[PDB]
Structure formats: structure tokens, C-alpha cells
Amino acid sequence: GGGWYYGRITRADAEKLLSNKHEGAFLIRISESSPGDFSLSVKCPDGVQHFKVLRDAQSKFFLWVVKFNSLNELVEYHRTASVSRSQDVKLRDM
């Protein structure tokens, strides 16, 4: 695991590279203009899409209203289900 961490990358780069070469491919990236917040990006059927992902002062990450210990506890359990719930896009890496 951990093949999904790309760090410094921006949205404009992410939408470029992440179209290679399968739907459900994903990367995790920072807000380079002001560090400490992050984005998930994913390959979808019309292009590439993005999702803001954060942590609290409690040192716990969140996506919804519910908290998890790291983004690894999101990704490793979210992967069996859709990021959209209206499209067949699920997180996958080979």
C-alpha cells in the first residue's frame, strides 16, 4: 500500500496524469499554495474528479462528519464502495 501518496501535486497536474490508464485510479495531494490541507483525486468516466480531505487539532482525519486515525483507515475500507454512489468509480491501485 501507500502507492497513492503524491504530495506536492496540484489539481491541474492531477487531471493531466491521473487519466492514465484506468477508471478508479487515485492520488493524494497537498494544497501547495498553503500547506496542511489535502485533496484526493480519482479517474472517473468523464475525466478526473477531486475530494477535499482534512485533519483536526485532535490529530484525526475526516471526510464526512465522522473521524478516522489516518487516511489509510479511510482508503483501506472505503475501496469496496463508490466515491459517488451514482457512478462505478472506486479507489484501486496496482
Swiss-Prot record:
Q: Which UniProt keywords apply?
A: Membrane, Repeat, SH2 domain, SH3 domain, Synapse, Transducer
Which Gene Ontology molecular-function terms are recorded? Answer: epidermal growth factor receptor binding; phosphotyrosine residue binding; sevenless binding; signaling receptor complex adaptor activity
Q: Which GO terms describe its biological process?
A: associative learning; epidermal growth factor receptor signaling pathway; epithelial cell migration, open tracheal system; fibroblast growth factor receptor signaling pathway; follicle cell of egg chamber development; imaginal disc-derived wing morphogenesis; insulin receptor signaling pathway; olfactory learning
Which residue numbers delimit the SH2 domain?
4-94
**Which subcellular locations apply to this protein?**
Membrane; Synapse
Tissue and organ distribution: Found mainly in the developing eye and in the antennal disk. Also observed in other imaginal disks tested and in the embryo. Expressed in Johnston's organ, the hearing organ, neurons (at protein level).
**What GO cellular-component annotations does this UniProt entry give?**
COP9 signalosome; cytoplasm; nucleoplasm; plasma membrane; presynapse; protein-containing complex
Describe the outcome of a gene knockout.
Embryonically lethal. Loss in Johnston's organ causes scolopidium abnormalities.
Q: What family is reported?
A: Belongs to the GRB2/sem-5/DRK family.
| Quaternary structure note | Interacts with autophosphorylated sev via SH2 domain and Sos, Dos and Dab via SH3 domains. Binds to tyrosine phosphorylated Dab via the SH2 domain. Interacts with phosphorylated Ack.
Functional description taken from the UniProt entry: Adapter protein which modulates signaling mediated by several receptor tyrosine kinases such as sev and Ack. Required for proper signaling by sevenless. May act to stimulate the ability of Sos to catalyze Ras1 activation by linking sevenless and Sos in a signaling complex. Required for functional and morphological integrities of the scolopidia, sensory neurons and the antennal mechanosensory and motor center (AMMC) brain neuropil. Required for Ack-dependent suppression of apoptosis in the eye.
The identity of this protein, by name, is Growth factor receptor-bound protein 2
Taxonomic placement: Eukaryota, Metazoa, Ecdysozoa, Arthropoda, Hexapoda
Residues represented out of the complete protein: 60 to 150 of 211
